[PDB]
Design a protein around this ligand. Structure first.
Ligand SMILES: Nc1nc2c(ncn2[C@@H]2O[C@H](COP(=O)(O)OP(=O)(O)OP(=O)(O)O)[C@@H](O)[C@H]2O)c(=O)[nH]1
Ligand SMILES: Nc1nc2c(ncn2[C@@H]2O[C@H](COP(=O)(O)OP(=O)(O)O)[C@@H](O)[C@H]2O)c(=O)[nH]1
Ligand SMILES: Nc1nc2c(ncn2[C@@H]2O[C@H](COP(=O)(O)OP(=O)(O)O)[C@@H](O)[C@H]2O)c(=O)[nH]1
Ligand SMILES: [Mg+2]
Lengths: 427, 329, 426, 146, 426
């Protein structure tokens, strides 16, 4: 029961680089490629004493990939699963979606197909991309497009690094974000936001890191990924495969935008003193101060929730905790769905990455929720996009790449349509 | 755990010496960074690194600064040369930081170290664990392996590996980096020794595909001891072309000084050629006589011309007629 | 991999080219004899951008020095790192223009730029995938401005798909070296506004005031000015030469800083810059860098941005850093002084990080600001050009060579429409 | 400066042209050197007796002076000071000899001249690498005519 | 956490600061070369209050030097503990005022204040949580009175929500240092009562008899007077840097000290003071330390505190003591001479106890007096003003640079009323 991971852009590679490091650490795989059956979903067993991942990095700049190639995990990722072009897209959906894609995407497509074919019980695809940068956004949408027309029936779970509301690293981020979402809407099955200010404050607040960097974020992201794929990876009292996410969280073909939260986010100094029970960690996974997305579900209404539990969890207590959450009216549900919970339990408690900050824990909870704060988020993005578009800025870049204002107009109205959709479903 | 009074609470607002230099690290691990630092961090290099000397920027080396300058003659008649010394363009020396900072510590290299004490060994898939069981008389294993392979086969192996290394770096302006990917890059303790499974691994990263029996033959040749370490500087010189071997070496001296010493060795070798055959009678004549002016008479009488340019080349050799004719022998 | 070909024009271009190749030889650890002397292997993987291997570990630069007078060539081969340049790259005439843009653009070009085009084309196709071209020259002198300008025209007409950086020194009225600074500045800028991709304005006024105030040197020579702009150029090419947490190539910087094809004039600053007597007393922290960077007295142009507005901005951070304090400082400088930015674009600031600081330094930053305060500089040049053209001073040494008056008129119209559009976006 | 009038010490800092340092005429006020660590009282600035303070007999031209923690290595003296030491402290001529605080600087490599390509003659070929603009070689017409 | 900014203006205020940073840098245990050499860790706990680690442990004091004549910039940098002040923090004029309040507040104040406003403001954002400000300057000088009080007015406008501590020397009738004392004294007082939150006035005649009669020094040079003042200033901020049973920060002082916004002119006192001739004949106990506090010969102001009343006061103790002994010692002195305290207030005196006595002692205190006998000072200076003002003597130096008589008329108006309200409550 295997899943094939794909990572796009400067972000995608780094997330995968931390994600795969965690995977090798969990299954007990030395960075040389082998140990000193649960790994079957990630590490194909070639020959003898070898474990190669069903992963692909793809990028237009050769810097970060070559770094990966010559780093510590040189023997692990074999040199053909890491696609690297010759020049980046440089924060431009158009250069990414039409010029450079037409030479990179075919090789990526012909490579994943033989990876899928060597796999046997493929469960789906798991994509991590960044829509803020050109390399991810444009080429990512292009890859998903070719992915859909090829297979279609297989699931595609998409974890995307949107722009943060106030703090930003780029300028043409709104253009690239909207140009990505106009196709991200109809191609991705379940979308999940991973904003960056959200995690900055979380790491600052909980793990009291004064001056963090992306790697702390990448490690927390990888922790999220492992905690939600644990069900496929290990055995539990009540597991759920990836086909269950969309079944229990996607009530409509175009309403798929999940919010992620984790608990407990506790460093070693606070771990010794904090009594960690399933109650408070289930409570903590509901605060707006503990979400991977900069939003406020207070202003919104939950649509459906999914709770993954790892570690020593008796199903009596998780049942008790979901019941007291349901009774507490600080959060309010939709009426379109009275019983809006899905649960999943796995025995394997999380692992500790030497060089991380999260102490070893008995139990952990990962919450995935659907709401309307996402529709609030998209509009807040839309406002400032039009602020810039009204003056026809930076558009000479895009029309020079070869595109036209028509795609701009269609993306603006598609966001508007999604806006009206989310407002309506909220009632 | 860290329970001593020196380690502080995470919610600590008091001052800690050197906490504005830490990053991406928890407070207690940050307090560990300041007191017992790792080599990678700046707190380590500010305390336990020797200072690099930039002697050209030192004001002490200029001796005219100790005294105030005193006036000399500036009369046009009371002069000896009519060309004042031309002012040299002053060198662009602006100090921007301490020279101790070795800046080459990439983020990935710090975040993604081999996260255990035994994983940086990086073994190969195909390896003979019996050979790492330090079995007795490794030299016998070398001798047996070499007698099983035959010497003519290693010549074929080095030749075909020469063909492969020649075939690898086709054309790029980064071909030297891949050449260093053989041994010197993934290497610490720059003493050029390589163990056998590490050698097999670095070989298979490039595509040599050596079986252990052929591998231990190379070691009987290039390491006739029980040490089991290889000096790759002697080895890769045969695989590489001499024009590109310098790229792998990294540093070759093209100095005018080294050229002049190569000139000096050539002159002394030519003069050794000159006095060589006639050295046998010169010592008998010199003992039959020592001054340099007398040496001219001896050397000219025996048959070799000896001049001023000969004495300047021989000045570094001697000052002894005995050791003189001996080094000529 | 991604390839940068360097071009230096005129006496100034030669000198700043020498210092730039000096600091590049330093940061890649190659000796003054052309052999590697470094220790870490991070340096060998990205020397392809600036050096070509020849024989026995001899990396020679991919540069073209261009001039008309042999004195500059003697100055090049006199100093250190002067014997690492290939003699075929010293394309060089014999006569000398002498502050005449017409001699710089019609007469001596006809016999020089042909050979220059030959050597740059051979040097273009010697490598595979260009990133673009980098040019450093003057606008007041003749043999650098016009010749390099015609070269800029010819390369843009052959290869439009490559990037183009222009570090040009503009005159200031107090540090007023030549008389015909306007006659050659306007004609150069009138050409590069259609040819050049983006430009980085330099001048000696702000730089002198920086060495006085912030560096406290009593008698700084041009060489120290060259070393500062040399640090600037290394800071702008640092991304392609070293890995990091968030890379930003030259195309990335252009697309994040140029919102309109005629709005391509930036302002440049550099940090940290403190006297060596004051090196010991201050800390090295992100706000400590940011406060020096956003200050008005640190720009390398004679234009106070507080008299104008910013369109866009960019910051390149070198050294192991904390991205959180990077972008929170950027957010704070963007929020506190909110009146000094444009309104219809949120998030005007691009930021990047490479994990390698320059040698001897711990943590640095390079700033590129597209502001509208540059129109004050062009206005200052326009009024003087009008002042002269009102009654036709010095004109005949131009019209007697092939130029005519409508060249001046179209130059004045271009600059005036440019300063009006800059004032409009303010 | 050691003032024989008051046995006070004054350390003047000398400045180099285009140093990175702000010009400050004096480096240490004219007060008698402590030479020792004294348990300070917050009310009264310490009264230092001559025995505690430094004396002219302590400077020995090669010793280290603990000036407020800084350890200055004195390495020379003026003619009047040397004469005074010989007159009054019975020092020998050799003690007054200045010690050299000088460190060498190494030259730059300055790559050699290339070995010749076997096409021209040595003399006509050397010019191409010697200079940029090639000059024809010079002969000994002095010996030619003679 | 809380951070103090120290400002040294004038000739007087400058030298005292040099003596201040000696006794402070001594307690926290940093040595004249800038390296920390304390033993306990109760010293590093609050080193940020007065210093910042820069790099290499070189702790630099957070203080601004400010003057107009190059003389003091030597006599500060030269003296011991002179190699720690940041060479950037030597913002500094060029001409010198010379006892003229006009030149120090209207002519040079035009071109120097924004220069000293630069570094001060900068240093404000340098630290995280400003505790307040703290200035040392004269009231009879030119630069200390002009450029000091001018900065005082300016900084209150930028930072209204911070404290203000002014350590000021005031003139004395017999020891007349300048001839225009009553001018520059009045012109600063009319400036201080609106901006300065609490003014700790000092003098010299009251310190000479302290150095001569208690300390029994025969040659009480400025190095001794400035040491006493350096002791009190450090005693004020005791509780910000060390633990204690009953902490009292800067504002906790002002709330118990200022009943009306304009009655805020304090007198200060320090204990225990004995000559080293009789150090070991006396006992050091709270019963004894106190009778040295409430003595009249022990204030640092030439105003016999018996010629008025005490509105309020405060006693800051240091070293391990028994609070019950403090509170009853402060009670008996409040009851036995009850005719010296004001009747419409209970608990005239606030006591506070830190837990670390100063280096060189084992138990110390510091007396701070908001008594109304301080009006006898302003009487002397005000009535002198009318004596000169009736004759317009020395006026044309003042009205020769922009000032007008009307300002002088208000100094009378302002002074005469605040000596009224003092007198209203006695
Ligand atoms: N959380 C997190 N965000 C990242 C990481 N790496 C990059 N990003 C985000 O990615 C955005 C920039 O996009 P990039 O991935 O660097 O660029 P790109 O998508 O490859 O497109 P080009 O730059 O044009 O090549 C920044 O705003 C970062 O916030 C990461 O490792 N973790
Ligand atoms: N910063 C800097 N400016 C220079 C240098 N050399 C010349 N300049 C400037 O260049 C201008 C004159 O350039 P010029 O030599 O006439 O250019 P050319 O005649 O075309 O080669 C003057 O304004 C100088 O200030 C230098 O080494 N550094
Ligand atoms: N206690 C004390 N007072 C001083 C010192 N130096 C100067 N003064 C006083 O300062 C006053 C003169 O200040 P002045 O030089 O005019 O200040 P400025 O000219 O404005 O900088 C005199 O009344 C002195 O008593 C000192 O070191 N200690
Ligand atoms: Mg990218």
């Amino acid at each position: 029961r295997e899943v094939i991971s794909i990572h796009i852009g400067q972000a995608g590679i780094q997330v995968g680089n931390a994600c795969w490091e965690l995977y090798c650490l969990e299954h007990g795989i030395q960075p040389d490629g082998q140990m000193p059956d649960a790994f079957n979903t990630f590490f194909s067993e070639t020959g003898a004493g070898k474990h190669v991942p069903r992963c692909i990095f793809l990028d237009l700049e050769p810097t970060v990939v070559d770094e990966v190639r010559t780093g510590t995990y040189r023997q692990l990722f074999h040199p053909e699963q890491l696609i690297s072009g010759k020049e980046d897209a440089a924060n431009n959906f158009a250069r990414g979606h039409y010029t450079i894609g037409k030479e990179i995407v075919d090789l990526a497509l012909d490579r994943i197909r033989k990876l899928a074919d060597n796999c046997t019980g493929l469960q789906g695809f798991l994509v991590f991309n960044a829509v803020g940068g050109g390399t991810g956004s444009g080429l990512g949408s292009l890859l998903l497009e070719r992915l859909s027309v090829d297979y279609g029936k297989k699931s595609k779970l998409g974890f995307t690094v949107y722009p943060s509301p106030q703090v930003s690293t780029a300028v043409v981020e709104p253009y690239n974000s909207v140009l990505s979402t106009h196709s991200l809407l109809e191609h991705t099955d379940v979308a999940v936001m991973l904003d960056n200010e959200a995690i900055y404050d979380i790491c600052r607040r909980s793990l009291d890191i004064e001056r963090p960097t992306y790697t702390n974020l990448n490690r927390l992201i990888a922790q999220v990924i492992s905690s939600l794929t644990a069900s496929l990876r290990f055995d539990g009292a009540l597991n759920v495969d990836i086909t269950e996410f969309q079944t229990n969280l996607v009530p409509y073909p175009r309403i798929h935008f999940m919010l992620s939260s984790y608990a407990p986010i506790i460093s070693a100094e606070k771990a010794y003193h904090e009594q960690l029970s399933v109650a408070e960690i289930t409570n903590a996974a509901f605060e707006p101060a503990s979400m991977m997305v900069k939003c406020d579900p207070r202003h919104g209404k939950y649509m459906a929730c999914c709770l993954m539990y790892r570690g020593d969890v008796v199903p009596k207590d998780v049942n008790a905790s979901v019941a007291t959450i349901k009774t507490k009216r600080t959060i309010q549900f939709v009426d379109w769905c009275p019983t809006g919970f899905k649960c999943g339990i796995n025995y394997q408690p999380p692992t500790v990455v030497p060089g991380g900050d999260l102490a070893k824990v008995q139990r952990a909870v990962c919450m995935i929720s659907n709401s309307t704060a996402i529709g609030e988020i998209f509009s807040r993005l839309d406002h400032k996009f039009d602020l810039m578009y009204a003056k026809r800025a930076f558009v000479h870049w895009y029309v020079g790449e070869g595109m036209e204002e028509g795609e701009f107009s269609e993306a603006r109205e598609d966001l508007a349509a999604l806006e009206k959709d989310f407002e309506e479903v909220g009632a | 755990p860290f329970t001593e009074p020196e380690w502080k609470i995470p919610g600590y607002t008091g001052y800690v010496q050197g906490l504005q230099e830490t990053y991406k690290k928890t407070p207690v691990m940050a307090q560990l960074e300041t007191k017992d630092p790792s080599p990678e961090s700046f707190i380590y290099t500010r305390t336990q690194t020797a200072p690099k000397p930039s002697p050209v920027r030192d004001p002490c080396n200029n001796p005219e600064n100790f005294k105030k300058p005193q006036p000399g003659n500036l009369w046009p008649a009371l002069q000896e040369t009519a060309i004042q010394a031309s002012f040299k363009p002053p060198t662009s020396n602006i100090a921007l930081g301490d020279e101790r900072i070795i800046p080459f510590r990439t983020s990935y290299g710090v975040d993604f170290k081999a996260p255990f004490n035994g994983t940086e060994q990086l073994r190969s898939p195909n390896r003979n664990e019996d050979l790492v069981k330090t079995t007795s008389s490794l030299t016998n294993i070398y001798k047996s392996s070499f007698n099983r392979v035959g010497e003519k086969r290693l010549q074929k192996m080095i030749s075909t590996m020469r063909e492969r290394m020649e075939a690898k770096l086709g054309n790029s302006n980064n071909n030297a980096f891949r050449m260093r990917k053989l041994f010197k890059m993934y290497d610490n303790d720059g003493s050029g020794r390589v163990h056998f499974e590490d050698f097999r691994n670095m070989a298979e990263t490039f595509g040599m595909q050596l079986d252990d029996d052929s591998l231990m033959a190379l070691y009987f040749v290039y390491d006739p001891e029980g040490s089991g370490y290889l000096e790759y500087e002697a080895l890769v010189a045969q695989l590489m072309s001499p024009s590109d071997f310098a790229f792998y070496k990294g540093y070759v001296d093209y100095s005018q000084d080294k050229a002049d010493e190569a000139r000096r060795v050539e002159l002394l070798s030519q003069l050794k050629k000159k006095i060589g055959p006639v050295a046998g009678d010169l010592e008998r004549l010199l003992k039959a006589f020592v001054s340099r002016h007398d040496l001219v008479a001896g050397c000219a009488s025996v048959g070799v011309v000896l001049g001023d340019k000969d004495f300047e080349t021989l000045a570094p050799v001697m000052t002894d007629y005995a050791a003189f004719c001996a080094v000529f022998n | 991999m991604r390839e940068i070909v360097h071009i230096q024009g005129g006496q100034c271009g030669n000198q700043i080219g020498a210092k730039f190749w000096e600091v590049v030889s330093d940061e890649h650890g190659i000796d003054p004899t052309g052999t590697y002397h470094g220790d870490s292997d991070l340096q060998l993987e990205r020397i392809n951008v600036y050096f070509n291997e020849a024989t026995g570990g001899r990396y020679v630069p991919r540069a073209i020095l261009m001039d008309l007078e042999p004195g500059t060539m003697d100055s090049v081969r006199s100093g250190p790192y002067g014997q690492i340049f290939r003699p075929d790259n010293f394309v060089f005439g014999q006569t000398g223009a002498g502050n005449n843009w017409a001699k710089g653009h019609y007469t001596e070009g006809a016999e020089l730029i042909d050979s220059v085009l030959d050597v740059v084309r051979k040097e273009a196709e010697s490598c595979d995938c260009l990133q673009g071209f980098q040019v450093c020259h003057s606008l007041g002198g003749g043999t650098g401005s016009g010749m390099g300008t015609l070269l800029i025209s010819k390369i843009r007409e052959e290869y439009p798909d490559r990037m183009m950086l222009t570090f040009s020194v503009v005159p200031s009225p107090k540090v007023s070296d030549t008389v015909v600074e306007p006659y050659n500045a306007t004609l150069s800028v009138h050409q590069l506004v259609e040819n050049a991709d983006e430009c980085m304005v330099l001048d000696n006024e702000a730089l002198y005031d920086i060495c006085f105030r912030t560096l406290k040197l009593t008698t700084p020579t041009f060489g120290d000015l060259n070393h500062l702009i040399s640090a600037v150029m290394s800071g702008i090419t640092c991304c392609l030469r070293f890995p990091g947490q968030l890379n930003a190539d030259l195309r990335k910087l252009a697309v994040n800083l140029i919102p309109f094809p005629r709005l391509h004039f930036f302002m440049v600053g550099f940090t940290p810059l403190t006297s060596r007597g004051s090196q010991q007393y201050r800390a090295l922290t992100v706000p400590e860098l940011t406060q020096q960077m956003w200050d008005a007295k640190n720009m390398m142009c004679a234009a106070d941005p507080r008299h104008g507005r910013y369109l866009t901005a960019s910051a390149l951070f070198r050294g192991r850093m904390s991205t959180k304090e990077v972008d929170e400082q950027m957010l704070n400088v963007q929020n506190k002084n909110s009146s000094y930015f444009v309104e219809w674009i949120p998030n005007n600031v691009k930021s990047s990080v490479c994990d390698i600081p320059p040698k001897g330094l711990k943590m640095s930053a390079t700033f590129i600001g597209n502001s509208t305060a540059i129109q004050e500089m062009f206005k200052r040049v326009s009024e003087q050009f009008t002042a002269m053209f009102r009654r036709k001073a010095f004109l005949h040494w131009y019209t007697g060579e092939g130029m005519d008056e409508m060249e001046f008129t179209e130059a004045e119209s271009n600059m005036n429409d440019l300063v009006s559009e800059y004032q409009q976006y303010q | 400066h050691y003032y024989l009038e008051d046995d006070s010490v004054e350390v003047l800092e000398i400045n180099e042209n285009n140093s990175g340092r702000d010009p400050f005429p004096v480096f240490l006020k004219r007060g008698p050197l402590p030479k020792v660590a004294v348990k300070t009282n917050t009310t009264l600035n310490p009264k230092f007796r001559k025995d505690q303070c430094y004396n002219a007999g302590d400077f020995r031209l090669g010793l280290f002076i603990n000036v407020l923690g800084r350890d200055f290595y004195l390495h020379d003296a003026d003619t009047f000071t040397k004469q005074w030491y010989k007159d009054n402290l019975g020092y020998t001529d050799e003690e007054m000899s200045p010690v050299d605080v000088k460190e060498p600087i190494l030259p730059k490599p300055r790559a050699a001249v290339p070995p010749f390509n076997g096409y021209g003659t040595i003399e006509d070929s050397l010019q191409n690498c010697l200079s940029l603009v090639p000059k024809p070689p010079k002969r000994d017409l002095h010996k030619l005519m003679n």
